[PDB]
């Protein structure tokens, strides 16, 4: 399948992602490494991602998330749940069982299977920040381990977040690598040490 662009693009509204500072304790379920631009998270745990804009986009703007393989030799392969997890009885009523990425706690989430590329994505309406806040947050879940056989199979993935208008045209784009693993704090520490070495 053709490969979606991963080029960072702030666009007219100054769109970019942000992440909370969670640390690398053994108790951490989700931690983001700025040095690696990489999120480490446990299976099906809440991953809060901040959406930042310099100016408010029009009503009907939406935010889409999609996973692609990071490595050149695999980026044409659709990222999907492995044969085991796609048959898990863990439906939330909205997400198709094949989709790796879910949005948690948003009843207006929509899930797309692209008719031409067959890629999966999940999209929600963009909303203005609440009273007293400067950004909005989306809660994502990753429903397969990076290591799952017959699925990601230890291959790294990227999540691409796109800001879109009501027709789906591109307004902004940002991305981050993801590792879904049992011990995100330990793995983030290891990979940051390797990068230093």
> How far apart (Å, rounded) are the C-alpha atoms in residues 20 and 30?
10
Which residues does residue 161 pair with via DSSP β-bridges, in sequence order? 65, 174
Q: Of 28, 51, 75, 82, which lies in the binding site for Zn ion, with binding defined by CB under 5 A?
A: 82
**Of the ranges 29-37, 95-103, 138-146, 167-175, which one interacts with Zn ion (CB under 5 A)?**
138-146
Q: Of 38, 64, 85, 119, which lies in the binding site for Zn ion, with binding defined by CB under 5 A?
A: 85
Residue, CB closest to Zn ion: 148
> How far apart (Å, rounded) are the C-alpha atoms in residues 10 and 2?
23
- Check residue 157 for interaction with Zn ion (CB under 5 A): no
- Check residue 143 for interaction with Zn ion (CB under 5 A): no
> How far apart (Å, rounded) are the C-alpha atoms in residues 155 and 70?
8
58 CB burial (10 A radius; 0-12, 13-18, 19+):
exposed
Residue 162 has φ and ψ, to the nearest 5°, of: -120, 135
| 183 is known to lie in a ligand binding site | no
| 181 is known to lie in a ligand binding site | no
* Residue located via tokens 């080029």: 7
Smallest CA-to-CA distance from 186 within 16, 25, 34, 12 is with: 25
- Check residue 144 for interaction with Zn ion (CB under 5 A): yes
- Check residue 148 for interaction with Zn ion (CB under 5 A): yes
Catalogue the E-assigned strands of 42-104.
Answer: 47-52, 62-69, 101-103
Nearer to Zn ion, 5 or 153 (CB): 153
The DSSP 8-state label assigned to residue 71 in this structure reads: S
Nearer to Zn ion, 128 or 150 (CB): 150
Classified as helix, coil or strand, 73 is helix
| 99 is known to lie in a ligand binding site | no
Nearer to Zn ion, 61 or 141 (CB): 141
Supply the minimum distance, in Å, between the C-beta of residue 84 and Zn ion: 5
| Count of residues that bind Zn ion according to CB under 5 A | 5
- Check residue 80 for interaction with Zn ion (CB under 5 A): no
Binding-site residue ranges for Zn(2+):
82, 85, 144, 148
Footprint of Zn ion (CB under 5 A): 82, 85, 144, 148, 151
């Amino acid at each position: 399948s053709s490969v979606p662009s991963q080029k960072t693009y702030q666009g007219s509204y100054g769109f970019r992602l942000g992440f909370l500072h969670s640390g690398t304790a053994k108790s951490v379920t989700c931690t983001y490494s700025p040095a690696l631009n990489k999120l480490f998270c446990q299976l099906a745990k809440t991953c809060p991602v901040q959406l930042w804009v310099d100016s408010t986009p029009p009503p009907g703007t939406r935010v889409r998330a999609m996973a692609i393989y990071k490595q050149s030799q695999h980026m044409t392969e659709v990222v999907r749940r492995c044969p085991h997890h796609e048959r898990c009885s863990d439906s939330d009523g909205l997400a198709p069982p094949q989709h790796l990425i879910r949005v948690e706690g948003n009843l207006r989430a929509e899930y797309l299977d692209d008719r031409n590329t067959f890629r999966h994505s999940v999209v929600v309406p963009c909303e203005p920040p609440e009273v007293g806040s400067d950004c909005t947050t989306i809660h994502y879940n990753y429903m397969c381990y990076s290591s799952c056989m017959g699925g990601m199979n230890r291959r790294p993935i990227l999540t691409i977040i796109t800001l879109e208008d009501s027709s789906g045209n591109l307004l902004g784009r940002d991305s981050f690598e993801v590792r879904v693993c049992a011990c995100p704090g330990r793995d983030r520490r290891t990979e940051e040490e390797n990068l230093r070495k």
